[PDB]
């Protein structure tokens, strides 16, 4: 996954 801000 990923933070969306990243």
């Amino acid at each position: 996954t990923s933070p969306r801000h990243l």
Partner: antibody, heavy 116, light 113 residues
Framework: VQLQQSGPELVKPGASVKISCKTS????????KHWVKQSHGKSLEWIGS????????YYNQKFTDKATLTVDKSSTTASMELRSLTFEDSAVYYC??????????WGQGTLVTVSS | DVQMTQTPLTLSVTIGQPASISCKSS???????????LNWLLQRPGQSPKRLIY???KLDSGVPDRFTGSGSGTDFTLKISRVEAEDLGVYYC?????????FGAGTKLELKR
């Protein structure tokens, strides 16, 4: 790969300015692009980040005051318009890669001098 | 905003000796997918940042191996076992689990000769 930042800018106090960043290879145009401000002699601050796919923008609340992030239709150029510029806005502004390439590639410019 | 306390602020190292830089955070950097988004960057003056460590411990593609990164949760450390002239500049930690992204103040590494 590269990020290619627009060049040095002289901007009167009160005006606005737009700084661009071109991706060299098609393969990185989809990636999230980050924007970081380094004041002279100083450390680094995060301005925000744009998703070239859909356009979603995520800002550091300190800069909603001041920064708009867009992308051209190709998503090959991510821009930053700094509105209503104060002397404290003189700095270097970087453009950096995101997603699984988070902060692996950085642009080179851009120096902004706010002065009359 | 996650506060990132980097220590020491300056470093002076005889070449061949090791270096160490610590990064402490006000919040945990563990993300709900089990990955911790903490990078180590190097900046030589005038130039732009280069990445050295990502996800706390992974070396980036070109980086020498005397660089290592460790830690978890709120304490992280970058270690250089043998420092050389090339390693000069300003080392930052940066976290990206939480928003806004926040950087350490920096660490100027100075070589002794």
């Amino acid at each position: 790969v590269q990020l290619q930042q627009s060049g040095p800018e002289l901007v009167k106090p009160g005006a606005s300015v737009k700084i661009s960043c071109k991706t060299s290879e098609y393969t990185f145009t989809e990636y999230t692009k980050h924007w970081v401000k380094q004041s002279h002699g100083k450390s680094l601050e995060w301005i925000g980040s744009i998703n070239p796919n859909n356009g979603d923008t995520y800002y550091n609340q300190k800069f909603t005051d001041k920064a708009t992030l867009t992308v051209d239709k190709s998503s090959t150029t991510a821009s930053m318009e700094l509105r209503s510029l104060t002397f404290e806005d003189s700095a270097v502004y970087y453009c950096a890669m995101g997603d699984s390439a988070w902060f692996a590639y950085w642009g080179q410019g851009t120096l902004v001098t706010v002065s009359s | 905003d996650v506060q990132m306390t980097q220590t020491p602020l300056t470093l002076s190292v005889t070449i061949g000796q090791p270096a160490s830089i610590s990064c402490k955070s006000s919040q945990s950097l563990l993300y709900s997918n089990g990955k911790t988004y903490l990078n180590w960057l190097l900046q030589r003056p005038g130039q732009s940042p280069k990445r050295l460590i990502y996800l706390v411990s992974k070396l980036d593609s070109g980086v020498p191996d005397r660089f290592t990164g460790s830690g978890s949760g709120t304490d992280f450390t970058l270690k250089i076992s043998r420092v050389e002239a090339e390693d000069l500049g300003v080392y930052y930690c940066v976290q990206g689990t939480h928003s806004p992204l926040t950087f350490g103040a920096g660490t100027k590494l100075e070589l002794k000769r």
